[PDB]
CSV table of C-alpha atoms and ligand atoms in Angstrom, one decimal:
chain,number,residue,atom,x,y,z
A,1,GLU,CA,110.8,99.7,72.7
A,2,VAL,CA,109.7,97.6,69.8
A,3,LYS,CA,106.7,98.8,67.7
A,4,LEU,CA,105.4,96.6,65.0
A,5,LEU,CA,103.6,98.2,62.2
A,6,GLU,CA,101.2,96.0,60.2
A,7,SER,CA,100.4,96.4,56.7
A,8,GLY,CA,97.7,95.2,54.5
A,9,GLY,CA,94.5,96.6,56.0
A,10,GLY,CA,91.4,96.0,53.9
A,11,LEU,CA,89.1,93.1,52.9
A,12,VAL,CA,89.8,90.4,50.5
A,13,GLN,CA,87.9,88.1,48.1
A,14,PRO,CA,86.8,84.4,48.6
A,15,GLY,CA,89.1,81.5,47.8
A,16,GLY,CA,92.4,83.4,47.8
A,17,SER,CA,95.0,83.7,50.8
A,18,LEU,CA,95.3,86.6,53.1
A,19,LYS,CA,99.1,87.4,53.7
A,20,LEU,CA,99.3,90.0,56.4
A,21,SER,CA,102.9,91.4,56.6
A,22,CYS,CA,103.8,93.4,59.7
A,23,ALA,CA,107.1,95.3,59.9
A,24,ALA,CA,108.8,95.2,63.3
A,25,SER,CA,110.6,98.7,63.9
A,26,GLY,CA,113.0,99.6,66.4
A,27,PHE,CA,115.2,96.4,66.2
A,28,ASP,CA,115.1,92.9,65.1
A,29,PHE,CA,113.2,90.1,66.5
A,30,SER,CA,116.1,87.3,66.3
A,31,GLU,CA,116.6,87.5,70.3
A,32,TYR,CA,112.9,88.1,71.1
A,33,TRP,CA,110.0,85.9,70.6
A,34,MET,CA,107.1,86.6,68.3
A,35,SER,CA,103.4,85.7,68.2
A,36,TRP,CA,100.3,86.5,65.9
A,37,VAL,CA,97.1,86.3,67.8
A,38,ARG,CA,94.0,87.4,66.3
A,39,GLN,CA,91.2,89.1,68.3
A,40,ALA,CA,87.4,89.5,67.8
A,41,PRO,CA,85.4,92.5,67.7
A,42,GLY,CA,84.4,93.3,71.2
A,43,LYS,CA,85.5,89.8,72.4
A,44,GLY,CA,88.7,88.8,73.6
A,45,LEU,CA,92.0,87.6,71.8
A,46,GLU,CA,92.8,84.1,70.5
A,47,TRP,CA,95.9,82.3,70.4
A,48,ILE,CA,96.4,81.3,66.7
A,49,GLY,CA,100.2,81.4,65.8
A,50,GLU,CA,103.0,80.7,68.4
A,51,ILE,CA,106.4,81.1,67.5
A,52,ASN,CA,110.0,81.5,68.9
A,53,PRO,CA,112.7,84.2,68.9
A,54,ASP,CA,114.6,82.4,66.0
A,55,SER,CA,111.5,81.0,64.3
A,56,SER,CA,112.4,77.4,65.2
A,57,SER,CA,109.2,76.0,66.4
A,58,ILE,CA,106.2,77.7,64.7
A,59,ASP,CA,103.5,76.2,66.4
A,60,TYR,CA,100.0,76.4,65.0
A,61,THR,CA,96.5,76.6,66.7
A,62,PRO,CA,94.7,73.4,68.0
A,63,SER,CA,91.8,74.1,65.5
A,64,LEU,CA,92.9,76.8,63.1
A,65,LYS,CA,96.0,75.1,61.5
A,66,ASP,CA,94.4,75.3,57.9
A,67,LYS,CA,93.4,79.0,58.2
A,68,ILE,CA,97.0,80.2,59.0
A,69,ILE,CA,100.4,79.9,57.9
A,70,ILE,CA,103.5,80.8,60.0
A,71,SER,CA,106.3,82.0,57.8
A,72,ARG,CA,108.7,84.6,59.2
A,73,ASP,CA,112.5,85.4,59.4
A,74,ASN,CA,114.4,86.3,62.3
A,75,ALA,CA,117.1,88.3,60.4
A,76,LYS,CA,114.3,90.1,58.5
A,77,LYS,CA,112.1,91.1,61.4
A,78,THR,CA,108.9,91.0,59.2
A,79,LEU,CA,106.4,88.3,60.0
A,80,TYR,CA,103.9,87.1,57.6
A,81,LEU,CA,100.4,86.0,58.7
A,82,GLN,CA,99.6,84.1,55.6
A,83,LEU,CA,96.9,81.4,55.2
A,84,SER,CA,95.5,79.1,52.3
A,85,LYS,CA,91.9,78.8,51.3
A,86,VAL,CA,90.4,80.9,54.2
A,87,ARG,CA,86.6,80.5,55.0
A,88,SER,CA,83.8,82.9,55.6
A,89,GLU,CA,84.0,82.8,59.3
A,90,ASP,CA,87.5,84.2,59.5
A,91,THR,CA,86.2,87.6,59.6
A,92,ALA,CA,88.0,89.2,62.7
A,93,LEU,CA,90.6,91.6,63.6
A,94,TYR,CA,94.0,90.1,62.8
A,95,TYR,CA,96.9,91.6,64.8
A,96,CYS,CA,100.6,90.7,65.6
A,97,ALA,CA,102.7,90.9,68.9
A,98,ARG,CA,106.1,91.2,70.2
A,99,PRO,CA,107.6,89.0,72.9
A,100,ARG,CA,105.2,88.9,75.7
A,101,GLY,CA,105.0,85.2,76.6
A,102,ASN,CA,108.7,85.1,77.6
A,103,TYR,CA,109.5,88.8,78.0
A,104,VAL,CA,108.2,91.2,80.7
A,105,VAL,CA,110.7,94.3,79.9
A,106,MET,CA,109.0,95.9,76.9
A,107,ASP,CA,106.2,93.6,75.7
A,108,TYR,CA,103.8,95.4,73.6
A,109,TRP,CA,101.4,94.1,70.7
A,110,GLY,CA,101.6,95.1,67.3
A,111,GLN,CA,99.5,97.4,65.1
A,112,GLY,CA,97.0,95.1,63.7
A,113,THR,CA,94.5,95.0,60.7
A,114,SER,CA,90.9,94.9,59.7
A,115,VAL,CA,89.5,92.4,57.5
A,116,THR,CA,85.9,90.9,56.7
A,117,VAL,CA,86.4,87.5,55.1
A,135,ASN,CA,88.4,75.2,83.9
A,136,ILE,CA,89.6,79.0,84.1
A,137,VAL,CA,87.1,81.8,84.3
A,138,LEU,CA,88.7,85.1,83.7
A,139,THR,CA,86.0,87.1,85.3
A,140,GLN,CA,87.0,90.7,86.1
A,141,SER,CA,85.0,93.2,88.2
A,142,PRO,CA,83.9,95.8,87.8
A,143,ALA,CA,83.4,95.5,83.9
A,144,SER,CA,82.1,98.8,83.6
A,145,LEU,CA,82.8,102.1,85.9
A,146,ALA,CA,83.3,105.7,85.8
A,147,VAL,CA,85.6,107.8,87.7
A,148,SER,CA,86.3,111.6,87.7
A,149,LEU,CA,89.2,113.5,86.7
A,150,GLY,CA,92.6,112.5,88.5
A,151,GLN,CA,90.5,110.0,90.5
A,152,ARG,CA,91.8,106.4,91.6
A,153,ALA,CA,90.2,103.0,90.8
A,154,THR,CA,90.9,99.7,91.7
A,155,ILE,CA,89.3,96.8,90.0
A,156,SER,CA,89.6,92.9,90.7
A,157,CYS,CA,89.8,89.9,88.6
A,158,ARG,CA,88.8,86.5,90.0
A,159,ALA,CA,89.6,83.2,88.5
A,160,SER,CA,88.4,79.7,88.9
A,161,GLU,CA,91.7,77.8,88.5
A,162,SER,CA,94.9,78.3,90.6
A,163,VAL,CA,96.0,81.9,90.8
A,164,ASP,CA,99.1,81.2,93.0
A,165,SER,CA,102.2,80.5,90.9
A,166,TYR,CA,105.3,80.7,93.2
A,167,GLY,CA,104.0,84.0,94.8
A,168,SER,CA,104.5,86.1,91.8
A,169,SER,CA,101.1,85.8,89.9
A,170,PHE,CA,101.8,84.9,86.2
A,171,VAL,CA,99.3,87.3,84.9
A,172,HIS,CA,99.1,90.8,83.4
A,173,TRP,CA,96.7,93.6,82.5
A,174,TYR,CA,96.3,95.0,79.1
A,175,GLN,CA,94.0,97.8,78.2
A,176,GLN,CA,92.4,98.0,74.6
A,177,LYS,CA,90.6,100.8,72.9
A,178,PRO,CA,88.0,100.9,70.2
A,179,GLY,CA,89.9,100.7,66.9
A,180,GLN,CA,93.4,100.7,68.9
A,181,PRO,CA,95.5,97.5,69.3
A,182,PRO,CA,95.6,96.0,73.0
A,183,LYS,CA,98.6,97.5,74.9
A,184,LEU,CA,100.1,95.9,77.8
A,185,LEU,CA,100.3,97.8,81.0
A,186,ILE,CA,101.7,95.1,83.6
A,187,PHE,CA,103.5,92.0,83.5
A,188,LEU,CA,103.7,89.0,86.0
A,189,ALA,CA,102.1,91.3,88.7
A,190,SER,CA,105.5,92.7,89.4
A,191,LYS,CA,106.6,94.8,86.7
A,192,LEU,CA,104.8,97.5,84.8
A,193,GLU,CA,105.2,98.2,81.1
A,194,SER,CA,107.4,100.9,79.8
A,195,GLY,CA,106.1,104.2,78.6
A,196,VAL,CA,103.6,104.6,81.2
A,197,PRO,CA,104.9,106.0,84.5
A,198,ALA,CA,104.4,104.1,87.8
A,199,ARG,CA,100.6,104.6,88.1
A,200,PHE,CA,99.5,101.2,87.5
A,201,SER,CA,99.9,98.7,90.6
A,202,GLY,CA,98.8,95.3,90.0
A,203,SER,CA,98.8,92.7,93.0
A,204,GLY,CA,96.9,89.8,94.3
A,205,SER,CA,97.5,87.0,96.9
A,206,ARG,CA,95.9,83.6,95.8
A,207,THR,CA,92.4,85.3,95.7
A,208,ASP,CA,92.0,87.6,92.7
A,209,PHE,CA,94.3,89.9,90.4
A,210,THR,CA,93.8,93.4,91.4
A,211,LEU,CA,95.2,96.5,89.7
A,212,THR,CA,95.0,100.0,90.9
A,213,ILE,CA,95.3,103.1,88.7
A,214,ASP,CA,96.0,106.6,90.0
A,215,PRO,CA,95.5,109.1,89.0
A,216,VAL,CA,92.7,108.6,86.2
A,217,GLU,CA,93.6,110.4,83.0
A,218,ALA,CA,91.7,111.0,79.7
A,219,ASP,CA,93.9,108.6,77.8
A,220,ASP,CA,93.0,105.7,80.0
A,221,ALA,CA,89.3,105.8,78.6
A,222,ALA,CA,89.5,102.2,77.1
A,223,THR,CA,88.3,98.9,77.8
A,224,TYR,CA,90.8,96.9,80.2
A,225,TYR,CA,91.5,93.4,80.4
A,226,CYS,CA,93.1,91.0,82.8
A,227,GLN,CA,94.9,88.2,81.1
A,228,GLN,CA,96.5,85.2,83.0
A,229,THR,CA,99.1,83.1,81.2
A,230,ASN,CA,99.4,80.5,84.0
A,231,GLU,CA,96.4,78.6,82.9
A,232,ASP,CA,94.6,77.8,79.8
A,233,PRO,CA,93.5,79.5,77.7
A,234,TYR,CA,96.3,82.6,77.6
A,235,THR,CA,93.7,85.0,76.0
A,236,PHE,CA,92.0,88.1,77.1
A,237,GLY,CA,89.8,88.4,80.2
A,238,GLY,CA,86.1,89.3,80.4
A,239,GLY,CA,87.0,93.1,79.7
A,240,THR,CA,86.7,95.9,82.0
A,241,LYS,CA,85.4,99.1,80.2
A,242,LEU,CA,87.0,102.2,81.8
A,243,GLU,CA,85.3,105.5,81.2
A,244,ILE,CA,86.7,108.9,82.2
A,245,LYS,CA,83.8,110.7,83.7
A,246,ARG,CA,84.0,114.3,84.3
B,253,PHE,CA,138.6,86.3,78.9
B,254,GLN,CA,135.5,84.5,77.7
B,255,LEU,CA,134.2,81.1,78.6
B,256,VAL,CA,130.8,80.6,77.0
B,257,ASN,CA,130.1,81.0,73.4
B,258,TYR,CA,126.3,81.3,72.5
B,259,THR,CA,127.0,81.0,68.8
B,260,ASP,CA,128.0,77.4,68.8
B,261,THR,CA,125.9,74.5,68.3
B,262,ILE,CA,124.9,73.2,71.8
B,263,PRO,CA,124.7,76.4,73.5
B,264,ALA,CA,122.5,77.9,70.6
B,265,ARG,CA,120.4,74.7,71.0
B,266,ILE,CA,119.8,75.1,74.9
B,267,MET,CA,119.3,78.9,74.2
B,268,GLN,CA,116.3,78.1,71.8
B,269,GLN,CA,115.3,75.3,74.1
B,270,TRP,CA,114.8,77.6,77.0
B,271,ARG,CA,113.4,80.2,74.9
B,272,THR,CA,110.8,77.7,73.7
B,273,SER,CA,110.0,76.5,77.2
B,274,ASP,CA,109.4,80.0,78.3
B,275,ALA,CA,106.6,81.3,76.2
B,276,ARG,CA,104.2,78.8,77.6
B,277,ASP,CA,105.1,79.2,81.5
B,278,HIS,CA,106.6,82.1,83.0
B,279,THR,CA,110.1,81.8,84.6
B,280,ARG,CA,110.6,83.1,88.3
B,281,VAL,CA,113.5,85.5,87.1
B,282,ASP,CA,114.0,86.9,83.5
B,283,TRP,CA,116.6,85.5,81.2
B,284,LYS,CA,117.8,88.6,79.6
B,285,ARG,CA,121.8,89.1,79.2
B,286,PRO,CA,122.6,85.8,81.2
B,287,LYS,CA,125.6,85.6,83.2
B,288,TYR,CA,128.3,82.7,83.2
B,289,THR,CA,127.0,81.7,86.7
B,290,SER,CA,123.8,80.3,85.0
B,291,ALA,CA,125.6,78.3,82.5
B,292,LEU,CA,127.9,77.0,85.2
B,293,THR,CA,125.0,75.9,87.3
B,294,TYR,CA,123.4,74.3,84.1
B,295,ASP,CA,126.6,72.4,83.6
B,296,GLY,CA,127.0,71.2,87.1
B,297,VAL,CA,123.2,70.1,87.1
B,298,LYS,CA,124.2,68.2,84.0
B,299,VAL,CA,127.3,66.7,85.6
B,300,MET,CA,125.4,65.6,88.6
B,301,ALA,CA,122.6,63.9,86.4
B,302,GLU,CA,125.1,62.1,84.2
B,303,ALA,CA,127.0,60.8,87.4
C,401,LIG,C1,132.5,81.5,69.3
C,401,LIG,O1,131.7,82.6,68.6
C,401,LIG,C2,132.3,83.3,67.7
C,401,LIG,C3,131.2,84.5,67.4
C,401,LIG,O2,130.9,84.5,66.1
C,401,LIG,C4,132.6,82.2,66.4
C,401,LIG,O3,133.2,83.4,65.4
C,401,LIG,C5,133.5,81.4,66.9
C,401,LIG,O4,133.8,80.5,65.7
C,401,LIG,C6,133.0,80.5,67.9
C,401,LIG,N1,133.8,79.5,68.4
C,401,LIG,C7,133.7,78.2,68.4
C,401,LIG,C8,134.7,77.3,68.7
C,401,LIG,O5,132.4,77.8,67.9
C-alpha cells in the first residue's frame, strides 16, 4: 500500500513560489499514475494537476495553469507541486494522491499540507447519526448518466476534519484495502448507494461520493457521518 | 520463453498510451500484470485494421 508523505506545511509570503514536495513511501510511482488535486476547506476537491505513471503527459488545469507547475520524476517517486507568482485567492488545502483514476487496487490519497496564500453529485443524507455497531446506508443521486457498462464508474471517499480524504470503494465493485469488507457500494442506474456495517468510532468523518464517469471528477456534496452513542 | 518486451520503443509507447487513456475513463477490467493474450488481441486488431 502506497503512502505519500507530504512535506512543506506552513504559510508563505506573496510574490514567491510555493513548491510542495511530497515523498511517496512504500515503492516508486513509475508504474502507477499520479495526481495533485487541491481541496478547499469544507468544500469538495478540485483537479488541478493531471499526470501519468511515467510522467509523460503532465496536463494542467483548464483555469489554473499559471498557479501550478507539474515537475516530478518516476524514478525518484517524489512529486513537486510548484507554481509561479501565486495570487491571494490560492489559499486552500493542497494535497497529493496516488493512482486513483486508473488504479482500483490500492488507490489512496497523499498526506496533504495547509497554506494560506450537467452533473449534480447530490448525496443523501448529508448528515446523520447512528448508534454503536449500527448500520447506515446512504444514497447519492446524479443528474447525468449513472449507468456505465453495468459497473458504475464511481467511488466513495470519506474525509475527516484535518485528515486527508481516504478512499473506501472503487468502481462500486471493489473496496479499498486496509478496511475490512464492511462498506458495500451499489446502485442500478438510479443512485449510488453505499452501506456501512457495523458503525465504529473511526468512521466519524464526512463521507463523499465522487464519480469519475462525468465532469467534474471532484468530490460530491459531502455526507457527514457522526458516530452517536 | 518470452514473446513480448515492454521495455522496447513501441510496446512502451502503447503502455503509456493506455495508461494515459485510462485515467480519464475507467476501463471495464483492470490492466495490472498484463498477459500475452492481451497483446495478441491488440496485434490481431491492428492486423485487421491494416488489412
Ligand atoms: C527486451 O527488454 C530487455 C529488458 O531490459 C532489454 O534488455 C532488451 O534489450 C530488450 N530487447 C529488445 C530487442 O529491445
